[PDB]
Design an enzyme around this catalytic site. Structure first.
Site, PDB file in Angstrom:
ATOM      1  N   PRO B  17       0.798  -1.228   0.000  1.00 58.08           N
ATOM      2  CA  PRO B  17       0.000   0.000   0.000  1.00 58.08           C
ATOM      3  C   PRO B  17       0.834   1.283   0.000  1.00 58.08           C
ATOM      4  CG  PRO B  17      -0.776  -1.627   1.624  1.00 58.08           C
ATOM      5  CD  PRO B  17       0.653  -1.991   1.251  1.00 58.08           C
ATOM      6  N   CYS B  18       2.069   1.195   0.528  1.00 60.38           N
ATOM      7  CA  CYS B  18       2.905   2.336   0.895  1.00 60.38           C
ATOM      8  C   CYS B  18       3.321   3.142  -0.337  1.00 60.38           C
ATOM      9  CB  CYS B  18       4.072   1.917   1.783  1.00 60.38           C
ATOM     10  SG  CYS B  18       3.514   1.085   3.296  1.00 60.38           S
ATOM     11  N   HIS B  19       4.366   2.695  -1.050  1.00 58.16           N
ATOM     12  CA  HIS B  19       4.851   3.369  -2.251  1.00 58.16           C
ATOM     13  C   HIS B  19       4.460   2.608  -3.528  1.00 58.16           C
ATOM     14  CE1 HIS B  19       7.309   4.069   1.357  1.00 58.16           C
ATOM     15  NE2 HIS B  19       7.181   5.343   1.028  1.00 58.16           N
ATOM     16  N   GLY B  20       3.521   1.653  -3.398  1.00 54.30           N
ATOM     17  CA  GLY B  20       2.941   0.876  -4.492  1.00 54.30           C
ATOM     18  C   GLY B  20       3.948  -0.008  -5.232  1.00 54.30           C
ATOM     19  N   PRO B  33       8.832   0.699  -6.760  1.00 59.10           N
ATOM     20  CA  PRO B  33      10.160   1.104  -6.269  1.00 59.10           C
ATOM     21  C   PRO B  33      11.102   0.073  -5.632  1.00 59.10           C
ATOM     22  CG  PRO B  33       8.382   1.926  -4.850  1.00 59.10           C
ATOM     23  CD  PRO B  33       7.724   1.441  -6.127  1.00 59.10           C
TER      24      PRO B  33
END
Ligand code: CDL
Ligand code: CDL
Ligand code: PSC
Ligand code: LOP
Ligand code: LOP
Ligand code: LOP
Ligand code: LOP
Ligand code: HEC
Ligand code: HEM
Ligand code: HEM
Ligand code: LMT
Ligand code: A1IKG
Lengths: 65, 54, 56, 378, 39, 98, 74, 240
Positions: B17-20, B33
């Site tokens: 969910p964070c940086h996808g 990433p």
């Protein structure tokens, strides 16, 4: 009750520097809006817009708090 | 460093969910990433139905 | 000169030079604290608890 | 006759700091030695006070430090002092090493190599101290760096795990780093004693680089006053930071407790290691990067052999002076690079800066020494 | 001439190299019989 | 020419501004120590002085008047003969011991 | 080695004055400003060049990082 | 994403080198934490006592403490009970652990606010422009739902819903509770929370600058005096 921030935001948007980033945002809205198959957003143009507005906001806002 | 959510993602494996980030069922980073793939530790399969990680 | 008066009175004897310095540090501590404090608390009028505490 | 000259203890202090023949003409650059001593005393005192209040358990540690800053009387000023103190120590250290290089003080071999060891020892100390609060940077910093010893083939993995005392930087690592961080300054004091002992065999160099026996002066009072003046200026500086800008030289992630599950966006060590971080980061290969990092420091030890000039000091060596300042600026650049994320253009700036660094020390400044020699018909 | 007509530390530094080898191997703990050959 | 550069360099170096001669600036190893030790009273005291002078100027962060600067043309290698021979001697003892 | 057998010096006269006979700051600005200028002119072409280049490599590379993070029309 | 908008620099009443925090502003800002933020966000490093001498009298602080329920250690029976808070109690955790906090916030953990000013680059400027910075996505941007657009956040997608708007609360002093006014006040409190020492430190700064103004020329003068013997000296070479 009127938030003095929304006042000053409007005043800042008057400025020449702001209007130029506003144009940049306008051109990019057309462009992304009108295509159905590419991957662009207008984050960039918005951000440098807010940057110009917010540096202006900073100078004035605090007076009236 | 977040915890990937299982049975999710463009690659039906793990979606952060964070940086996808998108890991496959092999855990390999596919789309996002996350520098490298997921961390494969040292295991041994003690019994037919037992595993040891360490 | 003033300095001459001081030298002969205070500074010639080393016992006296010391007695001068301890006594003067005493009055300097009190003076400097009080003055610098007032300087800060005027620079920061209104913003300190000790300025607003009368209200509560 | 006279006590200062006879008494077993006073004699030493006299010989060391009162009646010591000093050159007439040492500059402000010779202040740094005394200042380093102050730095060291400063850390020990502030350190000792902190340690009366801190705990080295993973669970209590972050909060024990903030407890110093909230609830211990004057704990805040003490803590910020010990932290800015560490910066001031590294400034003093790099200035001191600078003078060594420029004025050819490194010809004093024993003094010099002791000094290299002092540097390494203070480095270890500050590395482990930064871990003690158990912030995000503390933790992830200590993890990345210690892991480099994993790149040692054969033994790397085992060696790093033995340092840690487990499978990651965890409870056992922090408690041992506290221990090490406490005792190391003590060992630094002794090494420094020895550092001086050897210096006292030759007396000091001076900026001309020319022997100064024909114009020495008693240390006291000329250099007693002058060191004091310097110490004031150090204090001015230290406290400017502590009282006006206490966080200027630190990273904010170190206000966020250490979390083994969430890695910070950019991991950096303290600024005083950035030049070496950037050299390390320039090399693709991990053992390569390790050996470069080690060499960026240990090379100090070789500089004595790389001296070519017939003159000791750079005062009269224009070409060498330019190259010296090049090295200095390059280290400023290496520091900038080391604080930057690994992206264009910084990857390539860093690579170049790393090349330039070794190039200057191992090839250019040796050469310059020699060119200068020929320009002088020797 | 006279150094090279030294090189009398070559057989002595041979024996010191075995002391270094065997010393590191003792302090650190297969093909030596009995000692460790029988774990 | 070579000599054009050498003369520029001399002025850049700047030891001349303290009234030093080149030989005053040589770093003192054992060979140099000995060459100095063989200097005659005239030449030794002169050196002692030039250095006292320079050191005192270094202290003050000062230089001499240009009138007083050591001239490129007038700077004799006072030390070389003493030193060339000290070194010849050393090289000899080295040779011998092989 | 201590004062008494440092070295051998002949024929040198040192004249000086008590501090209490003299000014602490003789002609401090009138001599000192000129002297400081002289001192700086002497070193700036050795010292300043590197720092100029730093400022430039830092200016350029900071703005190269800027540019590369933007999008370009393609 | 991986872009910019770093905060502008607002002329806080405490930006100035010798300028203290506005304590009235801290008092209001506490209120903003208490009524708004404390539902999601802990602040484990502040106790009721810490408000005393800062923004609340001793009994005012006691009132505020008594208003909360806190667990207390085992009684006779060996059971836990609840009680009213005292000055000695730390401001209470809104959930009993981080995992509980996550469940309640769509999997995102709200950071503790003790140090927040200090643990984010930009401090007050950052946080202020965060709270007042929420805007509608630009053309082409679609965020996963329950993650909101904010140009000041890293990546621009924040898991915090805009917590601040006009009359979101009532002010003890009755200051116009406009959105910008409440973001200022909460920021001021958040600075103080991160650095209680701010005022004391700045006082000392002044006294350090003053003492150094005295001591630096003084000692410098001492130096010149001693060294005058040497500075003045004239050299004479006189061989026969
Ligand atoms: C294009 C646009 C963009 C710009 C970028 C491009 C750049 C272009 C320009 C080029 C710039 C780079 C080149 C450097 C400057 C040029 C050369 C030069 O310096 O010529 C001097 C030159 C050197 O004389 P010299 O005889 O050839 O050789 C010197 C001797 O070896 C020994 O001399 P002495 O024995 O007589 O002792 C006196 C000496 C003593 O020298 C030393 O001991 C060296 C260091 C100590 C400074 C002096 C003592 C004061 C204590 C300072 C700290 C206390 C707290 C104050 C706050 C610190 C400031 C941050 O003082 C000095 O020489 C002053 C120079 C100090 C320079 C320090 C460099 C600044 C660091 C910046 C790092 C970059 C990152 C920035 C981030 C910010 C921070 C977080 O001579 C003079 O100017 C006369 C010297 C006497 C001083 C004159 C009056 C000055 C007052 C001194 C006290 C204050 C100094 C300021 C310190 C910090 C300021 C930030
Ligand atoms: C980024 C970080 C940086 C890296 C480093 C950081 C590391 C940590 C720090 C470690 C420090 C290491 C340095 C060790 C040095 C130890 C001392 C040493 O060896 O000798 C000193 C070394 C040279 O000593 P020297 O006997 O002059 O040697 C002359 C040479 O023979 C050459 O002779 P010359 O005749 O060619 O010299 C020309 C002369 C002349 O050229 C000048 O530049 C003239 C300008 C002079 C400025 C004002 C003079 C102050 C008193 C004089 C009265 C007449 O220039 C000098 O003397 C050079 C020294 C520096 C100039 C003095 C300071 C300038 C500050 C301006 C402030 C203006 C307001 C003053 C009112 C004070 C009351 C608040 O000078 C320095 O490094 C400066 C230190 C002394 C400064 C104290 C003056 C007071 C300044 C105001 C205080 C305000 C406090 C805060 C605010 C207050 C609010 C109430
Ligand atoms: C009382 C309890 C304290 C316990 C610890 C022990 C501390 C020692 C002293 C403490 C009390 C303060 C009195 C100071 C004594 C006077 C100094 C003195 O007697 O000697 C001076 C040395 O101090 C100088 O340089 C000074 C200039 C440099 C700055 C150093 C000053 C030291 C400050 C004292 C610290 C106090 C500690 C407080 C802790 C709670 C000598 O200077 P002059 O050569 O120009 O004088 C020439 C002599 N004439 C003037 C008499 C002809
Ligand atoms: C001269 C030849 C040059 C060739 C070098 C090529 C490389 C091969 C050498 C291997 C030996 C390595 C052992 C020395 C350590 C060097 C690395 C180092 O600086 O380590 C220090 C600790 O100091 C320490 O660990 C040391 C504390 C005390 C130990 C004394 C060491 C004695 C050596 C001194 C020589 C005169 C820690 O610094 P870090 O936190 O890594 O720095 C952070 C940078 N991102
Ligand atoms: C692992 C260690 C790595 C290697 C170590 C590198 C050391 C880091 C450098 C710090 C600075 C060291 C200072 C060197 C000695 C100073 C020499 C000096 O003062 O030269 C001046 C010019 O001064 C000036 O122009 C003085 C200006 C001072 C400039 C500030 C330095 C910038 C800091 C950069 C930090 C990363 C000329 O002086 P002299 O030749 O003595 O002549 C005097 C007049 N006749
Ligand atoms: C064995 C004794 C050691 C003593 C060392 C002697 C120090 C010599 C140099 C002094 C520098 C002069 C500038 C000092 C400013 C002092 C002004 C002042 O009163 O500030 C102190 C804090 O300052 C401060 O706390 C500033 C002090 C800065 C001194 C730091 C250097 C020493 C390091 C100590 C580390 C263990 C407290 O002020 P307030 O809280 O208002 O208290 C009111 C008066 N009691
Ligand atoms: C692959 C990437 C590369 C980027 C590197 C970036 C970092 C370093 C960069 C640049 C530093 C260049 C320094 C050159 C300046 C030297 C020329 C000069 O300006 O001054 C000369 C000094 O003479 C002399 O010193 C004679 C001239 C000899 C100078 C040697 C130049 C070598 C510098 C190092 C380059 C890395 C003349 O000045 P002074 O003699 O002081 O007298 C002044 C009045 N004439
Ligand atoms: C629950 C509805 C919340 C209330 C009420 C407030 N906040 Fe919050 N906040 C919340 C979450 C789930 C998060 C995490 C966001 C993420 O993207 O993961 C946050 C975060 C913050 C931050 C951090 C910004 C950063 O750079 O990380 C700040 C400074 C913050 N919140 C402040 C804040 C203030 C001042 C509030 C009252 C005025 C407030 N929050 C209320 C959830 C909730
Ligand atoms: C060379 C000497 C020393 C250096 C360079 C040094 C360096 C450091 C550094 C960098 C930190 C981290 C500071 C921070 O950011 O919080 C630290 C923390 C600490 N140091 Fe030291 N230190 C030294 C000596 C000592 C000594 C002798 C002690 C104790 C006897 C000590 C005790 C501590 C303690 C308890 C902490 C944790 C509290 C804190 O983080 O401030 N230090 N040290
Ligand atoms: C804790 C760290 C250190 C302390 C306390 C220390 C202490 C001192 C002191 C008191 C002096 C004499 C004063 C001076 O000339 O500045 C000195 C000189 C010297 N130190 Fe250090 N030092 C330290 C680190 C180093 C390092 C890291 C080096 C080199 C890498 C070094 C090399 C020297 C040299 C060469 C001198 C002689 C300078 C000269 O006379 O010209 N020292 N040191
Ligand atoms: C100049 C030619 C015209 C077309 C390109 C114009 C853009 C400006 C020039 C740089 C081009 C970028 O292309 C390149 O990308 C890589 C990858 O990050 C970076 O370069 C780096 O690559 C890897 C990084 O892991 C290293 O092994 C390598 O040693 C180093 O050069 C530089 O940023 C740049 O050399
Ligand atoms: C000896 C000495 N020779 C020279 C110079 C200058 O060049 C000439 C030689 C000096 O500047 C000095 C010097 C060194 C330290 C010092 O003050 C101390 C003392 C002790 C101390 O604690 C420690 F742990 F180290 F012991 C901390 C600071 C004063 C003077």
């Amino acid at each position: 009750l009127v938030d003095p921030l929304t006042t000053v935001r409007e005043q800042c948007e008057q400025l020449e520097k702001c209007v130029k980033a506003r144009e940049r945002l306008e051109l990019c809205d057309e462009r992304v809006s009108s295509r159905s198959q590419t991957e662009e957003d207008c984050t960039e143009e918005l951000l440098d817009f807010l940057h110009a507005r917010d540096h202006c906001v900073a100078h004035k806002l605090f007076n009236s708090l | 460093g977040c915890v990937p959510i299982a049975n999710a993602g463009d690659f039906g494996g793990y979606y952060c969910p964070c940086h996808g980030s998108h890991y496959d069922a092999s855990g390999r980073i596919r789309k996002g990433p996350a520098p490298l793939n997921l961390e494969v530790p040292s295991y041994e399969f003690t019994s037919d139905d037992m595993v040891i990680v360490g | 000169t003033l300095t001459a008066r001081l030298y002969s009175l205070l500074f010639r004897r080393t016992s006296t030079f010391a007695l001068t310095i301890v006594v003067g540090a005493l009055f300097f501590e009190r003076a400097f604290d009080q003055g610098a404090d007032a300087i800060y608390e005027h620079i920061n009028e209104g913003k300190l608890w000790k300025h607003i505490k009368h209200k509560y | 006759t006279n006590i200062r000259k006879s008494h077993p203890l006073m004699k030493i202090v006299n010989n060391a700091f009162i009646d010591l023949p000093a050159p007439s003409n040492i500059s402000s650059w010779w202040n740094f030695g005394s200042l380093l001593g102050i730095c060291l005393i400063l850390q020990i005192l502030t350190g000792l006070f902190l340690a009366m209040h801190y705990t080295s358990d993973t669970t209590t540690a972050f909060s024990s430090v903030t407890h110093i800053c909230r609830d211990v009387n004057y704990g805040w000023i003490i803590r910020y002092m010990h932290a800015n103190g560490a910066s001031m120590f590294f400034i003093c250290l790099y200035m001191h090493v600078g003078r060594g290089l420029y004025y050819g003080s490194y010809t004093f071999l024993e003094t010099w190599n002791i000094g290299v060891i002092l540097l390494l020892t203070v480095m270890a100390t500050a590395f482990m101290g930064y871990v003690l609060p158990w912030g995000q940077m503390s933790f992830w910093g200590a993890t990345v760096i210690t892991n480099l010893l994993s790149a040692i083939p054969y033994i790397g993995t085992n060696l790093v795990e033995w340092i840690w005392g487990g499978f990651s930087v965890d409870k056992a690592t922090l408690t041992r780093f506290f221990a090490f961080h406490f005792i190391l300054p003590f060992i630094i004091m002794a090494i420094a004693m020895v550092h001086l002992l050897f210096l006292h065999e030759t007396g000091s160099n001076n900026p001309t680089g020319i022997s100064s026996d024909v114009d020495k002066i008693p240390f006291h009072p000329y250099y007693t006053i002058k060191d004091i003046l310097g110490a004031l200026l150090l204090i001015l500086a230290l406290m400017l930071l502590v009282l006006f800008a206490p966080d200027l030289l630190g990273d904010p992630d170190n206000y966020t407790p250490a979390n083994p599950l969430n890695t910070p966006p950019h991991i950096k060590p303290e600024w005083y290691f950035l030049f070496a971080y950037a050299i390390l980061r320039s090399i693709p290969n991990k053992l390569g990067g390790v050996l470069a990092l080690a060499f960026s420091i240990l090379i100090l030890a070789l500089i004595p052999l790389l001296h070519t000039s017939k003159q000791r000091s750079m005062m009269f060596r224009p070409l060498s002076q330019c190259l010296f300042w090049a090295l200095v600026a390059d280290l400023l650049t290496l520091t900038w690079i080391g604080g930057q994320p690994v992206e264009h253009p910084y990857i390539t700036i860093g690579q170049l800066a790393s090349v330039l660094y070794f190039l200057l020390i191992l090839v250019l400044m040796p050469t310059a020494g020699t060119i200068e020699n020929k320009l002088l018909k020797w | 001439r006279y150094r090279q007509l030294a090189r009398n530390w070559v057989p002595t530094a041979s024996l010191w190299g075995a002391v270094g080898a065997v010393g590191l191997v003792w302090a650190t703990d297969d093909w030596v019989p009995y000692i460790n050959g029988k774990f | 020419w070579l000599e054009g550069i050498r003369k520029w360099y001399y002025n850049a170096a700047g030891f001349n501004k303290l009234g030093l001669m080149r030989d005053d600036t040589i770093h003192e190893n054992d060979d140099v120590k000995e060459a100095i030790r063989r200097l005659p009273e005239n030449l030794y005291n002169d050196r002692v002085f030039r250095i006292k002078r320079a050191l005192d100027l270094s202290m003050r962060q000062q230089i001499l008047p240009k009138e007083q600067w050591t001239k490129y043309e007038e700077d004799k290698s006072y030390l070389e003969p003493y030193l060339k021979e000290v070194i010849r001697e050393r090289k000899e003892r080295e040779e011998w011991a092989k | 080695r201590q004062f008494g057998h440092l070295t051998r010096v002949r024929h040198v006269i040192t004249y000086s004055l008590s501090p209490f006979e003299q000014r602490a700051f003789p002609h401090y600005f009138s001599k000192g400003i000129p002297n400081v200028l002289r001192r700086t002119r002497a070193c700036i072409l050795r010292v300043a060049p590197p720092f100029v280049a730093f400022y430039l490599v830092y200016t350029w590379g900071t703005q190269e990082f800027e540019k590369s993070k933007r999008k370009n029309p393609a | 994403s991986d872009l910019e908008l770093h905060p502008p620099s607002y002329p806080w009443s405490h930006r100035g080198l010798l300028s203290s925090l506005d304590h009235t502003s801290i008092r209001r800002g506490f209120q903003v934490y208490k009524q708004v933020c404390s539902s999601c966000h802990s602040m484990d490093y502040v106790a009721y006592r810490h408000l005393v001498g800062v923004c609340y009298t001793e009994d005012e602080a006691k009132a505020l403490a008594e208003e909360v329920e806190v667990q207390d250690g085992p009684n006779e029976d060996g059971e836990m009970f609840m009680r009213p808070g005292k000055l000695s109690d730390y401001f209470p955790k809104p959930y009993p652990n981080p995992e509980a906090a996550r469940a309640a916030n769509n999997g995102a953990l709200p950071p503790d606010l003790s140090y927040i000013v200090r643990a984010r680059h930009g401090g007050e400027d950052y946080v202020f422009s965060l709270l007042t910075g929420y805007c509608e996505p630009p053309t082409g941007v679609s965020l996963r739902e329950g993650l909101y657009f904010n140009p000041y956040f890293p990546g621009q997608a924040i898991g915090m819903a805009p917590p601040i708007y006009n009359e979101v609360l009532e002010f003890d002093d009755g200051t116009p509770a406009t959105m910008s006014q409440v973001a200022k006040d909460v920021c001021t409190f958040l600075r103080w929370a991160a650095e209680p020492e701010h005022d004391h430190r700045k006082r000392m700064g002044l006294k350090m600058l003053l003492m150094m103004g005295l001591l630096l020329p003084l000692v410098y003068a001492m130096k010149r005096h001693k060294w005058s013997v040497l500075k003045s000296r004239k050299l004479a070479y006189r061989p026969p």
